[PDB]
Amino acid sequence: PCQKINVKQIAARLLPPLYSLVFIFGFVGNMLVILILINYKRLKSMTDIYLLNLAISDLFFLLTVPFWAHYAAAQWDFGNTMCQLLTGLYFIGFFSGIFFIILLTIDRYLAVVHAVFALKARTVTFGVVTSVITWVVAVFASLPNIIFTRSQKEGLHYTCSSHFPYSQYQFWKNFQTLKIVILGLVLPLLVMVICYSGILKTLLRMKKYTCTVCGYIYNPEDGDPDNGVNPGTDFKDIPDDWVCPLCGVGKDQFEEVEEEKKRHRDVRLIFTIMIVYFLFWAPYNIVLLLNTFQEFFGLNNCSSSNRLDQAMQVTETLGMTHCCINPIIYAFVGEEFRNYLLVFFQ
Numbered sequence: 001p002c003q004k005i006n007v008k009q010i011a012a013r014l015l016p017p018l019y020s021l022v023f024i025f026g027f028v029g030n031m032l033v034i035l036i037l038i039n040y041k042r043l044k045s046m047t048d049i050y051l052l053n054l055a056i057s058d059l060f061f062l063l064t065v066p067f068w069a070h071y072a073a074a075q076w077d078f079g080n081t082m083c084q085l086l087t088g089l090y091f092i093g094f095f096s097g098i099f100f101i102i103l104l105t106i107d108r109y110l111a112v113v114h115a116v117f118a119l120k121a122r123t124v125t126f127g128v129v130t131s132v133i134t135w136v137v138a139v140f141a142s143l144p145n146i147i148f149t150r151s152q153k154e155g156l157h158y159t160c161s162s163h164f165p166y167s168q169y170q171f172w173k174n175f176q177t178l179k180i181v182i183l184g185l186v187l188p189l190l191v192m193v194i195c196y197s198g199i200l201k202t203l204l205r206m207k208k209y210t211c212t213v214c215g216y217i218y219n220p221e222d223g224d225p226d227n228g229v230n231p232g233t234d235f236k237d238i239p240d241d242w243v244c245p246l247c248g249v250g251k252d253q254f255e256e257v258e259e260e261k262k263r264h265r266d267v268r269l270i271f272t273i274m275i276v277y278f279l280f281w282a283p284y285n286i287v288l289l290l291n292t293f294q295e296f297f298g299l300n301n302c303s304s305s306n307r308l309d310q311a312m313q314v315t316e317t318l319g320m321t322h323c324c325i326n327p328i329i330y331a332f333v334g335e336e337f338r339n340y341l342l343v344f345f346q
């Protein structure tokens with residue numbers, strides 16, 4: 001490419017304190033989640049198995065962060081095996097992380113959309129069996145990347161980087177780009193759209209409504225058959241000529257009842273987890289897509305080559321930072337996690 005700017009002198013001063021902070025806050029955060037799930041929650045649910053495995057893949061990702069900090073500040077002083085091992089934990093940590101967020105979304109889809117089936121399908125052992133396969137798939141998805149990585153001496157300094165075979169370089173840039181973009185953005189986004197379409201459809205058709213005038217409660221499960229409303233009818237699907245079976249007021253005098261079912265309330269946490277993941281990682285996937293491909297489809301200039309390379313460094317740093325965010329989410333969005341802390345203190 002073009003004669004890029006030396007940001008290595010800046011990165012040596014800026015990245016080590018940042019990475020040290022992320023590591024401390026993340027290690028403390030994910031260790032707390034793990035001990036709270038294994039000792040207070042005791043892993044009695046399928047959800048608890050996936051939440052534990054999600055914390056473990058964040059910890060795997062975290063263990064690498066102190067090594068990248070030293071490398072930034074000095075050089076690669078850890079040797080070749082360490083370079084492949086840590087690159088390995090970074091890719092494995094990443095892929096398994098998004099795989100456990102997908103499993104948590106499908107786990108919720110079953111409990112909410114196929115409720116009676118989920119009673120027999122959502123078991124702890126199935127959660128453990130599916131966790132093992134997930135880890136194996138993540139290891140195999142990360143394998144080409146571990147093989148291309150090595151430690152080498154470039155003049156006087158030691159490096160730890162990925163080296164694609166030349167006269168095949170564009171093929172591997174293209175292949176490794178589409179692998180991260182499909183598995184880290186296209187796959188979770190497709191899961192999200194399909195699963196939350198079904199979840200939202202169930203949540204809405206089971207929504208209870210109450211009359212603000214007489215206090216009558218409409219339950220879609222019962223309907224109002226004496227007024228020609230069949231059991232199983234969503235309140236929003238009732239024609240506007242229907243009136244309250246008690247006081248006789250219109251549909252406009254009705255208000256939504258707050259969610260009572262714990263399985264329906266649990267949708268808020270898992271949806272927040274997936275949406276926060278996209279805020280931290282979608283910027284990287286889009287910059288990665290632009291830097292590899294759209295470099296020909298859009299900007300090929302020397303100035304844009306440097307701008308897109310610096311943007312790749314910033315967005316990957318933002319993504320890395322995500323390994324310390326889920327514990328914050330559980331503390332504020334998770335009902336059980338905040339209730340435990342209230343008893344533990346008092």
Ligand SMILES: Cc1nnc(C(C)C)n1[C@@H]1C[C@H]2CC[C@@H](C1)N2CC[C@H](NC(=O)C1CCC(F)(F)CC1)c1ccccc1
Pocket residue numbers: 068069071072087090091094162172173174176177180292313316317319320
């Ligand atoms: C040192 C260093 N110092 N700080 C850092 C981080 C913590 C900020 N790091 C590194 C940067 C690198 C190299 C190893 C690891 C950690 N990172 C892996 C990046 C990886 N993308 C790819 O390999 C792309 C490269 C471009 C392409 F080739 F065209 C297509 C494939 C990825 C990104 C996100 C998830 C999984 C894997």
Ligand SMILES: CCCCCCCC/C=C\CCCCCCCC(=O)OC[C@H](O)CO
Pocket residue numbers: 056080081084085088089092131135139146
């Ligand atoms: C509840 C389940 C817990 C989750 C458990 C997840 C297990 C996956 C973790 C690490 C495997 C790392 C695989 C990388 C193997 C290292 C091989 C290597 O890179 O070393 C080559 C070196 O050159 C030779 O001299």
Ligand SMILES: [Zn+2]
Pocket residue numbers: 211212213214215216244245246247248249
């Ligand atoms: Zn009424």
